[PDB]
């Protein structure tokens, strides 16, 4: 059902979309594996650390 | 830079006491009184003492010869 | 307690050298008041000890120039807190990278055993010939390579490193190119064209 | 909110106290930031002291963690509110689903 | 021995865009080896040197600091400065052009309620700032939008008048990046003429600011400004 | 402060011989530093205009493959050999030279005959070592102008001409530059945070200095969009 919601949002179903260097502008060899994930901030600045 | 201080090491192997001979002539240079005999590539004077020790013509008995002439001279 | 500790957080440098710091421009100028002071008074941009203290604490863009005069071959030595052999304590040196951390080898964080997963960094300042001519002379990363308890030099090229160099060197049968009459320089016109 | 969840931070959030929850729910009269005021419906109400249900947002506050709290409206106005709805966000809630 | 010269005209006349924001820049005739770089390096030349106005500060009179709120609004100052931030907006004379608004009624306030002086572009007449209750709310301030290259912080502007500063300006950070992003197309043209031509096209996210020849025009300037001293070396005669 | 950017000066320089090429290029604003190095590693490296051996022709088996001979050195490297040398050519298009040697020695291509509009760069290039015997050898080598690098996978081969089996004529190479590279570094001036740091190295085969060869693809780029900003500078 993954692949079937993200194939369903035209987006490759292998989950994987050909990508460029933002640096050289060249293509990387090979489909790069990309995604929206949650990600979290904590305590541990090192403004209170350092 | 100096890439490593074994070359130092093939001019005269210690590594126990070239802290303080490179610390004396590096002394010398850097409280004053003393001039750099290298090239600089900005590289401080402590650098320029591992270069001079890697000259070859900066060793125990130059530091001795050399220092009882200044003070024999001053 | 020691002294002159920053107290930072390691973050890597990829770039630079393997005996180097990405000592950051927060960290720096606030345990090297010392030597601007001094640096200010030989070279005589200042005037009395107060005045210079007054040029510090008024964070002029002048004393950035020489502060970084006094950087590049002033040594700062590294350690990690839970320090278990010789190598932990190690001599780079240092420039200036915008930022609050400090970016460091990674092939020197298998030396350190440290991770990234934030634990502490103990940073101190060596003082004058004994320590910083003492680190340049024997501490220095590169300075001290070999291990004295395996016995083998002791270098971790490992992860992005060894996947890296595994898709460098290897075969493929058919795909493009066949074989190439270009020797030497074959890399520059055959791979990037 | 986070787009990959679970579905329990629904009730986690609205049974944790932090969010600004809403007592017997009615058209809302007035909003802002530093209170909130409810015109409830007659269906159900107490027959003495008559009245409408008030409430007092908490703007930034300091928490023993050092950090910030405060709760945000959720509605615009004129709404219909039922009982047990969210009116206000706390500190890292976003419509009464938890996001930190 | 080939065709010789270089492939002058990139071109660029005749654009087209589906929309204020979206844009489309046909780029016909290209070198064979041309055709990425031109695209890829402009871009790049482009998201890092750009001009572009974002609002810079507020000031508003009910309001002491940015955590307190005014009474009779549903969204904090934190919230109303961001809405705030995201207002894109040109100017021609001068760099500030301070400005102002205020009301009282029911509802959401427009970008147009901003009283009109000489240099003023409002792309966005939809946008919503804040909110009005109920009653009598008036919300009055002060909004001044100065020009700027990069991203600027707030922390190098409370650095900078750190000296002196009275109390009640709120202060945001200024991306003034009017250009959101850009896309091309590296598909090759087929000419009934001659050889093989290489043909580039850009779809162009922007903030409905700058127009887009104008931004390729004001990086190929910045592009061959910057080759200016590349013509000529230091030393290096014999 | 304002729209305008910065304009960097190179206080140094630095080169081995002919062959070696280091250049830095500091202060550089943010993200010009891939675009600089991107460009003229691109463009420099694919296009350039130049002098190449289009054909060799050898005495003896016309066929590609070929044995005993007394050549002392395989076909191929002989062509390798020939492919290592670089020809100034004046304005023709095309021009034919010849190669014959006697006696014992090695084959130098200063004893290659000698044309008023041809010039070879270096007396030390060596085609073939001495052969047995005398064994007199008979070339005639054909070279062109071409901008790019001829691949030998894809060619017409005069259909059934010195055709041969496949591939056919003689690899050549346009563009007289050997390596191409740079690095992106951080530079620091005064209050400001990052900035881009450039650094060009180049090796170049010869017979152009390889910072002339750069201010030439400058010019060809520059050449290239000269008429887009055209309009966009009034002077």
């Known amino acids: ?36 994930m949650y990600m979290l901030k904590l305590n541990h600045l090192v403004d209170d650390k350092m | ?32 009184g003393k001039d750099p005999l290298v090239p600089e590539e900005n590289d401080k004077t402590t650098v320029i003492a591992l270069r001079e020790i890697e000259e070859g013509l900066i060793n125990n008995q130059i530091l001795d010869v050399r220092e009882r002439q200044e003070q024999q001279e001053q | 307690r020691v002294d002159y500790s920053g107290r930072s957080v390691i973050t890597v440098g990829p770039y630079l050298r393997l005996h180097q710091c990405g000592l950051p421009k927060k960290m720096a100028l606030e345990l090297f008041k010392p030597f601007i002071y001094g640096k200010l008074e030989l070279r005589g941009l200042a005037t009395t000890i107060k005045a210079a203290k007054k040029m510090v604490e008024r ?25 278990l052999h010789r190598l932990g304590i190690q001599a780079f040196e240092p420039v200036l990278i915008e930022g609050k951390a400090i970016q460091l080898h990674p092939l020197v964080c298998a030396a350190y055993n440290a991770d990234f997963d934030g634990d502490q960094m103990a940073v101190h300042v060596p003082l004058t010939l004994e320590a910083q001519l003492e680190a340049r002379a024997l501490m220095m990363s590169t300075n001290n390579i070999l291990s004295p308890a395996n016995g083998e030099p002791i270098i971790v090229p490992s992860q992005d490193v060894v996947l890296g160099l595994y898709y460098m060197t290897r075969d493929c049968v058919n795909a493009k190119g066949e074989g190439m009459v270009l020797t030497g320089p074959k890399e520059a016109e055959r791979l990037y064209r | 909110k986070p787009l990959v969840g679970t579905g329990m931070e629904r009730a986690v959030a609205v049974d944790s106290g932090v969010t600004a929850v809403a007592k017997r729910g009615g058209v809302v009269q007035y909003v802002d930031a530093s209170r909130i005021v409810i015109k ?22 300091r928490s023993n963690q050092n950090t910030c709290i405060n709760q945000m409206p959720c509605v615009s106005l004129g709404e219909p509110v039922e009982r047990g709805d969210v009116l206000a966000d706390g500190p890292s809630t976003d419509l009464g689903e938890l996001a930190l | 021995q080939g065709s010789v010269t270089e492939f002058l005209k990139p071109r660029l006349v005749d654009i087209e865009q589906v929309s204020s924001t979206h844009a489309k820049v046909t780029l016909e005739p290209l070198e064979r080896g041309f055709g990425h770089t031109l695209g890829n390096a402009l871009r790049r030349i482009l998201l890092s040197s750009m001009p572009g106005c974002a609002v810079t500060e507020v ?89 700027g290259r990069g991203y600027v912080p707030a922390s190098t502007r409370i650095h900078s008048e750190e000296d002196e500063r009275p109390i009640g300006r709120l202060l945001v950070d200024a991306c003034y990046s009017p250009v959101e992003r850009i896309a091309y197309n590296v598909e090759a043209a087929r000419v009934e003429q001659r050889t093989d031509l290489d043909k580039l096209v850009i779809e162009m996210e922007t903030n409905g600011t700058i127009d887009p020849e104008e931004a390729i025009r004001r990086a190929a300037t910045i592009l061959a400004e910057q080759l200016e001293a590349f013509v000529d070396l230091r030393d290096v005669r014999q």
């Open chain 1, 1 to 36: 059902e993954i692949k079937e919601l993200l194939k369903l949002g035209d987006l490759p179903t292998s989950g994987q979309i050909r990508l460029y260097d933002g640096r050289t502008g060249e293509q990387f060899e090979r489909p790069v594996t990309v995604g929206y």
């Open chain 4, 40 to 61: 409830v419906n007659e269906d159900e109400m107490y027959p003495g002291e008559a009245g409408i249900d008030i409430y007092n947002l908490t703007k930034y506050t």
């Open chain 5, 59 to 147: 000031e508003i009179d009910g309001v002491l600091h940015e955590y307190s709120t005014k009474e009779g609004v549903q969204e904090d100052i934190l919230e109303i400065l961001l809405n705030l931030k995201g207002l894109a907006v040109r100017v021609q004379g001068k760099d500030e052009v301070i400005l102002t608004l205020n009301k009282s009624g029911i509802g959401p306030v427009t970008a147009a309620d901003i009283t009109h002086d000489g240099d003023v572009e409002i792309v966005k007449p939809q946008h919503v700032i804040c909110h009005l209750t109920d009653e009598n709310a008036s919300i009055s301030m002060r909004i001044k939008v100065q020009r």
């Open chain 3, 59 to 83: 964070e002029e863009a002048v004393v950035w120039d020489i502060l970084d005069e006094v950087i590049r071959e002033h040594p700062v030595l590294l350690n990690r807190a839970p320090t």
């Open chain 2, 1 to 32: 830079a100096r890439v490593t201080v074994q070359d130092a090491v093939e001019k005269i192997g210690n590594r126990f006491d070239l802290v303080l001979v490179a610390a004396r002539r590096a002394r010398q240079m850097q409280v004053g």
